[PDB]
């Protein structure tokens, strides 16, 4: 029982409430390390090198320095730590603004509102909120500028709605309007404990000395925003994180990609070859120290202690060959994807001009999947159409009426059901005539278009009136029903008034109760009380959900309206149905109590009131139907034609009728005039089995030619799809949908949009993409792989829960063809090069165990090897993985066939992984056997008979290695930009200068005493400059001659396009 006192800060302070501070920062200066280390050491590479460093701390085992691995581990750890800290700076910067805005609090000591900050707001302080500024906390409305005390708030942020709401104030508290009289308000405010129900509240406010009941209509959430009212006086109840905006926290799922799984297999491949190289050397060591025990007497070996010799020698080659698993790879590939998302969400061709909404990639872990998408689960309304509705036609009592009959079907033959069109003037003449029988039907129809809805009107200075409707077809019904007779004027709580432009009278309909339109319910109802004393109910929705509630005792307009829905949908018009039912007071006395219990239930409300709503919609008298126009977006016919030309199959999951999607599908160039449609419209589960069997056998009885398989399309409604998703029939449905180039599902439930996406991905291997708008296809986006959200008129519910938010549908032709093919080809080669550059060097450590009696002696310096994966070979991967374009963007869209390269996986696989690995072994052996023939006995210098040694030769190996590694990237790159000349030739000049400086200064500080005299014997020797010229050319003559052959006498698809790009 939360007890709140009006004013009196000393009274409510003893309870110990929270403070209005908001912080979404995960890392703080108090427990940063206890959670960052547990998160960083959870991966494979980090935990592997943690045990390697702990093993390296035993005596007489480490072949290099004691800190050559933990030093490199901390470098890649702080690079990951600074990025984890930068994101927390942006989160802390965003939370600072929410604690910096102004909030004037009524101070009883000053008798006026004193401006303070949000963090200074305390429970029980009366605040004054102005217009167009958000609410700081959960505050009840005491009074406002309106005569009754109501306000119009926009409860976005917490939800996806954009329309306005209405919160009314109690008659006892609406009296205190003046600022000076606020000091007289006093009493207790008993409220509930902080909960998460956004639509429930059961507080109790005791104004003065008498208590009054509360309701959820007198509670504004923190995420809301005042829209039209000038000022509001609010009493804070919940503050800080106790508010229903942050107390109801959410969770985000983690999605893995295809390349991430191939990487996991490539790591196991290197881990197996690691144990092989360790066991080969460890066995050869234990047999040579036993066979040649006399020729190795100058080493003073242990002798009888050979049980632990294998273990000590196992740890030695573990530390030696541990560099074959690059730790710089995971950090590089993470920054490459993070940087590619930046270059994608900053393009002009992906920026919408009409609305400043650029493309944003909320999850940068799914960027490479754009170059390998095969299925697209789309949507009709909003995604394929502009979602701007326009009332065009209507049908009342079996008669159709439009404006300006087109041409031929002017006269009506009256062959039973009326077919044709009339004029709107004939509708008015049929209306005002009291002698007609269908005149009350037309009156009840027109009142349905401007009463049953839930639209808030807005008045302007120009005398006109504007309707702000949440659903775009709602505004079409209000404006369509207004510009011919019954106009909707002003809306207020518990009342709806209309004005008849024919006679000038004004009617007041007492809005007694309403029922919200749910995407699963597919039907809206609203029960009013007419001024005559009757209580008449109105209902509207889809035909697949209203006709089940009709009757047959007194309903003769069914066969007439059903035929009119067919000719409307055959043109592409979005149609609805209208119904009504007169109820009594004997049944409403009990049904009202049922609705009240369903509204104030703490258990569940999203489904409880839906059941109580269908309890009253028993009978329905169909009055007529409507028809609304909706056009396609711009450039959509061109993108779908190009996406299908690239080999992508598009599935449409629409919740509307069937013939509408087929007509807009032919105009959208999705279907065709010669395409064979395969309809499946069944009524029972057994009927769907025979239909699916008749489909599959008729397909396999004959071969499918190229022209035959291309001209197949499956059309299955919602009821038929509900049966074909059972475990017995899901296999029959999936085997017939893979043969048709297009699939059009109709009348699909919101939750059925997820079952279709999950069924295809759990019984196949292709990657799925789901694009849509609104709260009906939010589960479709969360269930697929790459989820795309469209920001349209339905709100911002789907654009926030998606991975990529796009302005419209046109931008998929470039997000997938250009930015997808690049992202896949870039990250693929960048990882293959990272495995090659690391193997081409540390493999010489293996060819050397055959020359040091399998001891495990390092060929190169301990710290010079650690700088390999940190300084000199960390930029060619970034250039080829971010700024590389294997084909021009102008030709990537002209020839959409190139998308099939990445769609099949022709750039990244385990078979190609071994190709780069054994290429490293080949280059490793060339530099090894090449130098040992030149530095034979060390007698390779010409400086007064002096000789080289161990360290003067390891430098030549290290230097020749990086010239071939960087020389390999030169053949890999396709585009030579300014960033390329800095990473490939620039990294070479970096080493040619860093070594004479490092080897002449650091040996004096006891860091690398092995380089005391190696600069003179290398840079001063004429043989060192000749081995660097012939060995790199000798090892890269294979790649140069093979690249010329495959490009010339065995080209691929892009090998010919790159030639046309060059010569044109």
């Amino acid at each position: 029982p939360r007890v709140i006192h009006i004013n009196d800060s000393l009274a409510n302070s003893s309870f110990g409430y929270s403070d209005n501070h908001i912080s979404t920062t995960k890392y703080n200066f108090a427990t940063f390390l206890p959670k960052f280390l547990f998160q960083e050491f959870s991966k494979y590479a980090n935990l592997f090198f943690l045990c390697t460093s702990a093993i390296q701390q035993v005596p007489h085992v480490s072949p290099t320095n004691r800190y050559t691995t933990i030093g490199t581990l901390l470098v890649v750890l702080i690079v990951s730590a600074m990025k984890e800290c930068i994101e927390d700076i942006k989160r802390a910067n965003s939370d600072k603004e929410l604690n910096n805005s102004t909030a004037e609090i009524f101070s009883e000591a000053h008798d006026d509102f004193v401006e303070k900050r949000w963090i200074d707001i305390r429970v029980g302080d009366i605040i004054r909120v102005k217009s167009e500024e958000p609410i700081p906390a959960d505050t009840i409305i005491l009074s406002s500028s309106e005569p009754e005390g109501l306000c119009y708030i926009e409860t976005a942020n917490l939800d996806g709605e954009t329309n306005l709401k209405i919160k009314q104030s109690r008659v006892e508290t609406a009296k205190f309007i003046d600022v000076k009289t606020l000091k007289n308000m006093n009493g207790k405010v008993v409220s509930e404990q902080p909960n998460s129900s956004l639509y429930t509240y059961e507080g109790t406010m005791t104004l003065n000395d008498r208590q009054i009941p509360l309701s959820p209509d007198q509670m504004i959430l923190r995420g809301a925003t005042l829209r039209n009212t000038a000022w509001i006086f609010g009493l804070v109840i919940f503050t800080g994180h106790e508010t229903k905006l942050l107390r109801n926290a959410t969770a985000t799922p983690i999605k893995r990609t295809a390349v991430e799984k191939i990487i996991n297999r490539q790591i196991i491949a290197l881990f197996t070859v690691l144990i092989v190289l360790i066991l080969i050397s460890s066995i050869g060591n234990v047999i040579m120290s036993t066979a040649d025990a006399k020729h190795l007497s100058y080493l003073y070996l242990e002798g009888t202690n050979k049980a632990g010799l294998f273990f000590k020698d196992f740890l030695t080659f573990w530390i030696l060959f541990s560099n074959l698993v690059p730790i710089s790879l995971f950090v590089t590939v993470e920054l490459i994807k993070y940087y590619q998302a930046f270059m994608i969400g900053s393009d002009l061709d992906l920026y919408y001009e009409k609305t400043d909404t650029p493309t944003v990639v909320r999850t940068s872990s799914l960027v490479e999947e754009l170059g390998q998408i095969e299925y697209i689960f789309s949507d009709k309304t909003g995604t394929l159409t502009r979602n701007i509705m326009e009332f065009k036609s209507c049908s009342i009592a079996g008669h159709c009426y439009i404006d300006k009959i087109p041409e031929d079907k002017t006269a009506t033959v009256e062959d039973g059901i009326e077919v044709g069109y009339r004029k709107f003037d004939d509708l008015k003449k049929k209306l005002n005539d009291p002698s007609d029988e269908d005149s009350p039907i037309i009156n009840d129809f027109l009142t349905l278009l401007a009463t049953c809805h839930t639209v808030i009107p807005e008045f302007q200075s120009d005398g006109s009136i504007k309707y702000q409707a949440a659903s775009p077809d709602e505004g079409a019904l209000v404006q369509g029903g207004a510009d011919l007779g019954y106009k909707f004027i002003i809306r207020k709580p518990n009342s709806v008034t209309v004005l008849l432009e024919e006679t000038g009278e004004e009617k007041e309909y007492q809005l007694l109760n309403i029922c919200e339109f749910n995407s699963t319910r597919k039907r809206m109802s609203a029960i009013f009380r007419f001024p005559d004393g009757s209580i008449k109910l109105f209902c509207k929705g889809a035909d697949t959900v209203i006709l089940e509630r009709l009757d047959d005792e007194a309903n003769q307009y069914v066969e007439a309206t059903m035929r009119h829905l067919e000719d409307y949908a055959s043109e592409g018009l979005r149609t609805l149905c209208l119904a009504m039912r007169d109820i009594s007071e004997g049944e409403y006395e009990e049904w009202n109590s049922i609705y009240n219990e369903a509204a104030t239930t703490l258990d569940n409300r999203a489904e409880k009131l839906d059941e109580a709503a269908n309890l009253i919609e028993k009978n329905l008298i169909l009055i007529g139907a409507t028809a609304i126009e909706d056009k396609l977006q711009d450039g959509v016919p061109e993108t779908i034609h190009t996406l299908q030309e690239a080999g992508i199959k598009i599935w449409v999951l629409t919740g509307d009728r069937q013939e509408t999607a087929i007509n807009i599908g032919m105009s959208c160039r999705l279907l065709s005039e010669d395409m064979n449609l395969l309809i499946i419209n069944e009524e029972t589960r057994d009927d769907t089995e025979r239909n699916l069997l008749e489909k599959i056998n008729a397909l396999n009885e004959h071969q499918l030619s190229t022209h035959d398989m291309n001209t197949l399309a499956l059309v299955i409604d919602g009821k038929s799809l509900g049966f074909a998703l059972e475990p017995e029939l899901e296999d029959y449905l999936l085997t017939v949908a893979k043969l048709c180039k297009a699939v059009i599902c109709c009348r699909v439930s919101p939750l059925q949009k997820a079952l279709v996406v999950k069924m295809v991905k759990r019984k196949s291997s292709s990657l799925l993409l789901a694009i849509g708008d609104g709260a009906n296809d939010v589960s479709m986006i969360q269930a697929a792989h790459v989820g795309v959200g469209i920001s349209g008129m339905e709100g911002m519910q789907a654009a926030r829960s998606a991975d990529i938010a796009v302005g419209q549908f046109k931008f998929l032709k470039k997000l997938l063809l250009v930015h997808g093919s690049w992202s896949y080809q870039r990250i693929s080669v960048a990882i293959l090069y990272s495995f090659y550059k690391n193997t081409a060097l540390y493999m010489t450590q293996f060819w050397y165990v055959f020359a040091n009696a399998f001891s495990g002696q390092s060929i190169m310096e301990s710290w010079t090897m650690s700088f390999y994966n940190l300084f000199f070979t960390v930029w060619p991967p970034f250039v080829i993985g971010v700024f590389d374009q294997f084909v021009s963007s102008r030709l990537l869209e002209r020839y959409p066939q190139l998308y099939k390269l990445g769609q099949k996986g022709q750039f990244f696989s385990v078979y190609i992984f071994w190709g780069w690995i054994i290429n490293g072994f080949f280059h490793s052996a060339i530099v090894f056997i090449g130098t040992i023939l030149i530095y034979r006995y060390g007698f390779a210098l010409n400086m007064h008979g002096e000789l080289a040694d161990h360290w003067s030769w390891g430098v030549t190996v290290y230097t020749t290695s990086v010239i071939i590694v960087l020389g390999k990237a030169a053949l890999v790159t396709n585009q030579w930009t300014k960033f390329t000349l800095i990473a490939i030739p620039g990294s070479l000049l970096f080493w040619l200068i860093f070594f004479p400086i490092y080897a002449s200064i650091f040996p004096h500080a006891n860091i690398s005493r092995e380089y005391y005299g190696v600069v003179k014997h290398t840079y001063g020797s004429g043989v060192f400059w000749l081995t660097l010229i012939v060995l790199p050319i000798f090892a890269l003559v294979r790649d140069f001659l093979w690249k010329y052959y495959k490009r010339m006498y065995e080209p691929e698809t892009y090998h010919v396009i790159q030639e046309m790009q060059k010569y044109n």
Binding site: H60, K294, H295, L296, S297, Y298, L299, Y300, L301, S346, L348, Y351, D356, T357, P358, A851, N852, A853, S855, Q857, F883, Q885, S889, Y895, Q897, G930, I934, Y935, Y937, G938, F939, A940, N942, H944, G945, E946, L947, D949, H950, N974, Q975, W976, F979, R1009, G1013, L1026, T1027, V1030, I1033, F1034, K1043, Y1044, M1048, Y1049, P1051, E1052, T1053, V1056, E1059, M1060
Partner: protein, 355 residues
């Protein structure tokens, strides 16, 4: 900030829009075939130039191992052809001969005797070749105290632990700690080519044979001879322990510095003597070698090398052929790809893609 000047339109720069100017390399036959004939054109003079430089080197190797068994004692018998190797600009008439000789208390010596058939104008260098000796062993390459080499009197408990087997003998600090000093090659050379029959001697220089940095870092010790003991393998030259006079000076001892530089391969040379002042005239010479280092310790061999010097070391055609191999592969595929272009061209269209 009520209006909120956001304007999320990204910039139109060449970086953000990925429109940077660049160069696309194409492997046209007109841009590859001239490259292959160019590499062959420049690597052939360099290739034949490096084999001629290695050809002009004149050397002579005499494997003096097994001299205390297979060599004579009373006269100079011929050395088996299995051991001797030589390369000279002129023909050699007399085969090299050797003879064993012992001294007092059993001090053997191998007296080699060879012939130089031509006047060697270049300077003369003399190495010794040790085979099957692994100085690149991990336990061996790091076994030496770097502070004792500088000359400090490091106490026992502060000694480097990388010389654990040979360290602190009989509770006394072994001054040259490690396996590298204890396993030192201790054969002595005559330091003069004794001319025979109308040929004068040819003195050789023992100083300035190690690296310049070695002479700088190797400094005379500051220990007391009553607190140190010689390494185990040095207890023959320094019996009864160390004294104030027996204590060696590792700054002047350049044979110690040359040995401490561990080699990379089990086959390595080590410089000991040289002469850069005058030429070596033709005649017959003799080299006396005290036999102190047994080949049974490391199971390898011992050789006496007498070489000159060239631009690329001394007598080695490994680098010379690599320039000819690369020039050979380029000239090979340079003609293979040329006739394939003349006879059977691709003729795979021009603008017609594969799809």
């Amino acid at each position: 900030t009520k209006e909120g000047p956001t304007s999320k339109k990204p910039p139109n720069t060449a970086f953000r829009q990925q429109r940077l100017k660049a160069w696309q390399p194409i492997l046209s036959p007109q841009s590859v075939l001239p490259l292959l004939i160019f590499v062959a054109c420049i690597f052939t003079p360099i290739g034949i130039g490096l084999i001629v430089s290695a050809t002009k080197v004149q050397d002579l190797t005499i494997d003096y191992s097994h001299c205390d068994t297979k060599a004579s004692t009373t006269a100079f018998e011929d050395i088996p052809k299995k051991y001797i190797k030589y390369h000279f600009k002129s023909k050699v008439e007399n085969k090299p001969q050797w003879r064993l000789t012992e001294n007092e208390n059993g001090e053997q010596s191998c007296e080699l005797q060879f012939e130089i058939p031509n006047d060697i104008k270049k300077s003369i260098f003399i190495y010794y070749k040790i085979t099957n000796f692994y100085q690149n062993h991990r336990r061996y390459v790091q076994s030496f105290d770097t502070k004792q080499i500088l000359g400090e009197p490091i106490k026992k408990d502060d000694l480097d632990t990388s010389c654990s087997p040979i360290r602190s003998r009989e509770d006394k600090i072994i001054y040259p700690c490690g396996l590298i000093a204890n396993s030192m090659f201790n054969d002595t050379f005559s330091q003069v080519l004794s001319g025979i029959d109308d040929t004068e001697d040819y003195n050789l220089t023992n100083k300035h044979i190690s690296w310049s940095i070695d002479r700088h870092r190797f400094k005379t010790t500051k220990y007391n001879a009553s607190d140190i003991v010689p390494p185990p393998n040095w207890m023959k030259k320094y019996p009864d322990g160390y004294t104030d006079e027996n204590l060696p000076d590792i700054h002047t001892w350049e044979e110690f510095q040359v040995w401490m530089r561990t080699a990379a391969f089990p086959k390595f040379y080590k410089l000991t003597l040289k002469n850069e002042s005058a030429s070596l005239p033709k005649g017959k010479y003799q080299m006396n070698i005290e036999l102190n280092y047994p080949i049974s310790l490391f199971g390898g061999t011992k050789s006496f090398v007498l070489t000159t010097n060239g631009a690329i070391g001394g007598r080695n055609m490994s680098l010379g052929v690599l320039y000819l191999i690369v020039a050979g592969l380029c000239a090979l595929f340079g003609i293979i790809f040329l006739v394939k272009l003349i006879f059977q061209p691709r003729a795979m269209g021009d603008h017609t893609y594969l799809n």
